[PDB]
Scaffold this active site. Structure first.
Site, PDB file in Angstrom:
ATOM      1  N   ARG A  11      18.689  -7.890   9.456  1.00  0.00           N
ATOM      2  CA  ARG A  11      18.037  -9.336   9.404  1.00  0.00           C
ATOM      3  C   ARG A  11      18.946 -10.512   9.735  1.00  0.00           C
ATOM      4  NH1 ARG A  11      21.042 -11.675   5.649  1.00  0.00           N
ATOM      5  NH2 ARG A  11      21.331 -11.431   3.561  1.00  0.00           N
ATOM      6  N   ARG A  14       0.901  -1.171   0.010  1.00  0.00           N
ATOM      7  CA  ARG A  14       0.019   0.090   0.040  1.00  0.00           C
ATOM      8  C   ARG A  14       0.736   1.132   0.001  1.00  0.00           C
ATOM      9  NH1 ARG A  14      -5.378  -1.090  -0.190  1.00  0.00           N
ATOM     10  NH2 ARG A  14      -6.111  -2.924   1.089  1.00  0.00           N
TER      11      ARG A  14
END
Ligand code: GSH
Ligand code: GSH
Ligand code: GSH
Lengths: 143, 143, 143
Positions: A100, A27
């Site tokens: 990560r 989005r």
């Protein structure tokens, strides 16, 4: 099995959550489906969810085989930190492709050792019966 | 279940191994994460691991349902050659996108027939009780 | 388990079918492997199969945990409409990336509520024993 089923249910919640957070970044950066490529962020966020999704079944097998064929409480405890080391991982990848790493270490740590337990447990089951068969044949009159 | 759990554990090892060999080619061709696109080789190697990962759960269900609902030893034997026909497949795709074909044939061969067993086994379970219900209702006074 | 195993077997058939229909569009638009990018159609069709594949294990866990730990017939009924709301979904995405929405709604509808059942069922199992432990410790001489 109940703890194993509890840990798997967390897994599924965790997976669905990443999935939702990808829809969010999809989005934000106006990345129309079916495009899976945009900014580095969407490309990192989408990537984490994609790696977590490909490691989930590996984690579900072996969780279920480490409990059941080795100890369950042990298996469910690894399963638990693994999922945490995957929450943190997707959190990380969102920040950077190096934020990560830290939780990806804690994760593969917990994902093996689950393989170790499932391995041990399965050998603890097949080896006796094998060596019994090995010796029985090699007897033979034992004179 | 033990053989089924043995075959699944191989699957998970095999999957983790492809996964590691992708990290290797990711290193070699300097393909920084989260990029999943580079040379044809990295794009082929990464692709094999991605297809193997999407066929693993399909293979785990149906392995577990072909054993349990049809014969296990039968199921575990297919499960075994399937995984081999997937080792060879990732080996192949690394070489070329046609050296992937030969083991991809041996694999879908073994992946169906597992569906056939799981199908037969499940019909062997539901059909009797159905036809019993079918006939019982259609009796009716049998005069 | 039989219905659960029946629904999972449908899932696997459904997954394999999408997989085949991707090979079809891969042929049509001459998209040589390992390319996963071409026209918007191949990019939409390939995308549906990729999302269905990442939601399959989530659906298999929780199906198996909603049956077993909550009611099975209930679980298998959701499992069933979910798979239908995924057939229709891949049908949709092939048409357009908005004809995917309607069945994607019916799908996440059925995929949660399966989480709700698996959640309820697991709480129905752990909570009593917990509150028993909670009260037992807090007694203490009850004078
Ligand atoms: N967990 C999914 C979210 C839902 C999904 O499966 N997305 C579909 C239909 S909404 C899609 O168009 N995929 C594009 C994407 O990678 O987001 C994901 O992160 O992709
Ligand atoms: N099996 C994984 C290896 C580990 C993994 O999940 N990779 C992550 C974090 S190391 C990633 O950044 N994905 C990029 C990639 O496709 O390699 C893979 O082949 O992708
Ligand atoms: N379900 C698979 C079909 C078979 C498969 O795993 N494809 C492999 C070998 S035939 C491949 O080269 N992947 C490229 C692709 O995404 O189609 C898919 O849709 O990708």
């Amino acid at each position: 099995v109940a703890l194993l089923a509890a840990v798997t249910l967390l897994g599924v919640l965790l997976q669905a959550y990443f999935s939702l957070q990808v829809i969010s970044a999809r989005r934000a950066f106006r990345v129309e489906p079916p495009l899976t490529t945009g900014p580095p962020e969407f490309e990192r966020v989408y990537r984490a969810q994609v790696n977590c999704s490909e490691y989930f079944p590996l984690f579900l097998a072996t969780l279920w085989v480490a409990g059941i064929f080795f100890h369950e409480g042990a298996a469910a405890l690894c399963g638990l930190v693994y999922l945490f080391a995957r929450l943190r991982y997707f959190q990380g990848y969102a920040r950077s492709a190096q934020l990560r790493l830290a939780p990806l270490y804690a994760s593969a740590r917990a994902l093996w050792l689950l393989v170790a337990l499932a391995a041990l447990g399965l050998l603890a089951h097949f080896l006796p019966a094998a060596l019994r068969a090995a010796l029985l044949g090699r007897l033979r009159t034992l004179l």
